[PDB]
Amino acid sequence: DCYRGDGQSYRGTLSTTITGRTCQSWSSMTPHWHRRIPLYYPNAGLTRNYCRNPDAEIRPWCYTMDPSVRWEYCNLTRCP
Amino acid sequence: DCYRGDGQSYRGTLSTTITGRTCQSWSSMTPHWHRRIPLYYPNAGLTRNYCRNPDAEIRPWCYTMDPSVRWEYCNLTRC
Amino acid sequence: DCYRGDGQSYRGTLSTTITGRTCQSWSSMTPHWHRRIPLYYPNAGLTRNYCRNPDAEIRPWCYTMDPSVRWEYCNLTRCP
Ligand SMILES: O=C(O)[C@@H](Cc1cccc(CN(Cc2cccc(C[C@H](C(=O)O)[C@H]3CCNC3)c2)Cc2cccc(C[C@H](C(=O)O)[C@H]3CCNC3)c2)c1)[C@H]1CCNC1
């Protein structure tokens, strides 16, 4: 599994961060309250807890299930 | 008056930061808008402007009344 | 074109950050959702996308048109 460019187009199902943490669901505010919700980013594919890039970071990312770690990049490599 | 561990259990009355600033009230959104509110933290004892640790910081903290400084650790020692 | 004190009083028309990005409009909620609007800061001169200091930063600042970069200080030096 891989991403192209900055990964805004990435629509895979990876839900694990670079440090092995589980992604938080985009539709949950727990443990991290956020504004990266389907209502505000309807074309960004904010499904379940999948790694995404709704706000033009360098690569796909997610909020994490670890209360002490708000968000991280995903364990995902750049495409050949 | 002191905290144990990471101070998630702290329920004392200290309301002052490690720089001497006064804590903002948890129920207040001014000068700092936030979501450390009883709705998302029912167990956290978020009362008045008391130093608390709802969200697993390393020690009790509060939003500060200084508009320049969003939040700081509290002037509290470990038991 | 410069700021006095920490620039709370500043009402010039600069709309460019330190890294040369352009300010988002204060009334606009896109790309960054925020609280710094005419309602919650009534005397701050939150007009168009002009560099302001309503919330007691060290210097005037703005939210940026870059969706990733939330806010930056403006390219404005202090008055001599
Ligand atoms: O992470 C994000 O969601 C995204 C960035 C983002 C977007 C929108 C708003 C924020 C800011 N929030 C906190 C916050 C709320 C109100 C106001 C501010 C500060 C102001 C502002 O940024 O509007 C500035 C403006 C100029 N001087 C102050 C900050 C972020 C926030 C939201 C919830 C909790 C915290 C951390 C806690 C807090 O500050 O509660 C601290 C408090 C102690 N424990 C943790 C921080 C951040 C990134 C994710 C990947 N892409 C970008």
Numbering used by the authors:
A (entry chain A), C (entry chain C): 0 to 79
B (entry chain B): 0 to 78
Reproduce, without paraphrasing, sentences from the article in which this PDB structure was first reported.
Lipoprotein(a) (Lp(a)), an independent, causal cardiovascular risk factor, is a lipoprotein particle that is formed by the interaction of a low-density lipoprotein (LDL) particle and apolipoprotein(a) (apo(a)). Lp(a) is a lipoprotein particle that is formed by a two-step process involving interactions between a LDL particle and another protein, apo(a). The goal of our research was to develop a potent and selective orally delivered small-molecule therapeutic to inhibit the formation of Lp(a) by blocking the first interaction between apo(a) and apoB to reduce the circulating levels of Lp(a). In summary, we report the discovery and optimization of potent and selective small-molecule inhibitors of Lp(a) formation by exploiting the repeated KIV domain structure of apo(a) through compound multivalency.
Taking further advantage of multivalency, a trimeric molecule, LY3473329, was synthesized. Crystal structure analysis of the interactions between LY3473329 and KIV8 shows that the trimeric molecule is capable of binding to three KIV8 domains simultaneously, which suggests that multi-KIV domain interactions are possible in apo(a). LY3473329-HCl salt binds to KIV8 selectively with a potency of 22 nM and inhibits the formation of Lp(a) particles in vitro with an IC50 value of 0.09 nM (n = 9). Multivalency, which allowed the engagement of multiple apo(a) KIV domains, considerably increased the potency and efficacy of inhibitors of Lp(a) formation in both in vitro and in vivo models of Lp(a) reduction, as compared with monovalency. A comparison of residues near the inhibitor-binding site reveals that only human PLG K-2 preserves the DxE side chains that make key interactions with LY3473329. Oral doses of prototype compounds and a potent, multivalent disruptor, LY3473329 (muvalaplin), reduced the levels of Lp(a) in transgenic mice and in cynomolgus monkeys. These data support the clinical development of LY3473329—which is already in phase 2 studies—as a potent and specific orally administered agent for reducing the levels of Lp(a).
